[PDB]
């Protein structure tokens, strides 16, 4: 199907405990393939040269310094003291369709958890969150940064994502369907919980819903966040509280990429 490549970078100052830590992690969809950590690889990555690895190592080193200097600049923009710790995050990368062509590129930043600046979908213009980010925007417009970012996103990003998908196809292009069952747990004489499970699926995207008499139970469904199992796969469950004796009015519905057709499940006593 469709795929994404995304880098998640975190720079965090720590006054009195050295220079800010910089960590960059790269993903294809829900598979991490690279990590660089200033505080010191997928198999289909090792098959690239040691030259590929050096070139990316150099980039990580330069990025470390750029984000460190940016943290300094940002505390200035917000009139902040040197005493506190602050965080600069960024996400960049590309989404492609089944044919491998660019759907959309991304390059955006947050400071202390708050959106700061983002490259617009046009890959030519910026959206700044506040008067500080407007400084960054003006500097980046003057230095024609968006043109460099666009070149990466339309070129390097798409080209390498295509290569990774080809070299890592047995995993990256394999969707593993959820294994599903419904469990039943009495709460009292009067009510029981029905819990619909999805286990062992990849990628993480999934839809799990309960219906009662064919009606969506959005407000009455407890949905846990999709969670990693540790073996590349993910897990999720959805639960509803039902009156004793009424269990057969409830159906669990599962949609996932690895499924030929959606599942409809009920409790089977």
């Amino acid at each position: 199907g469709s795929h994404s490549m995304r880098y998640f970078d975190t720079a965090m100052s720590r006054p009195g405990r050295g220079e800010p830590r910089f960590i960059s992690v790269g993903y294809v969809d829900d598979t991490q393939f690279v990590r660089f950590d200033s505080d010191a690889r997928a198999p289909w990555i090792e098959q690239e040269g040691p030259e590929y690895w050096d070139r990316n190592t150099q980039i990580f080193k330069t990025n470390t310094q750029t984000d460190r200097e940016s943290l300094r600049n940002l505390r200035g923009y917000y009139n902040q003291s040197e005493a506190g710790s602050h965080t600069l995050q960024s996400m960049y990368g590309c989404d492609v369709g089944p044919d491998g062509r660019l759907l959309r590129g991304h390059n955006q930043y947050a400071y202390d958890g708050k959106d700061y600046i983002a490259l617009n979908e046009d890959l030519r213009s910026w959206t700044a969150a506040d008067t500080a980010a407007q400084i960054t925007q003006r500097k980046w417009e003057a230095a024609r940064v968006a043109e460099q970012d666009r070149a990466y996103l339309e070129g390097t990003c798409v080209e390498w994502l295509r290569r990774y998908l080809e070299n890592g196809k047995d995993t990256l292009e394999r969707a593993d369907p959820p294994k599903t069952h419904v469990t039943h747990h009495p709460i009292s004489d009067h009510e029981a919980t029905l819990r619909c499970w999805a286990l062992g699926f990849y990628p993480a995207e999934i839809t799990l819903t309960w219906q009662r008499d064919g009606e969506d139970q959005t407000q009455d469904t407890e949905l846990v966040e999709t969670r990693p199992a540790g073996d590349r796969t993910f897990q999720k469950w959805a639960a509803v509280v039902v009156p004793s004796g009424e269990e057969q009015r409830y159906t669990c519905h599962v949609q996932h990429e690895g499924l030929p057709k959606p599942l409809t499940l009920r409790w089977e006593p």
């Binding site: 330069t62 200097e69 960024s90 930043y109």
Partner: peptide
């Protein structure tokens, strides 16, 4: 493949 961040904010 990573992208150079060569411009300070």
């Amino acid at each position: 493949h990573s992208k150079k961040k060569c411009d300070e904010l």
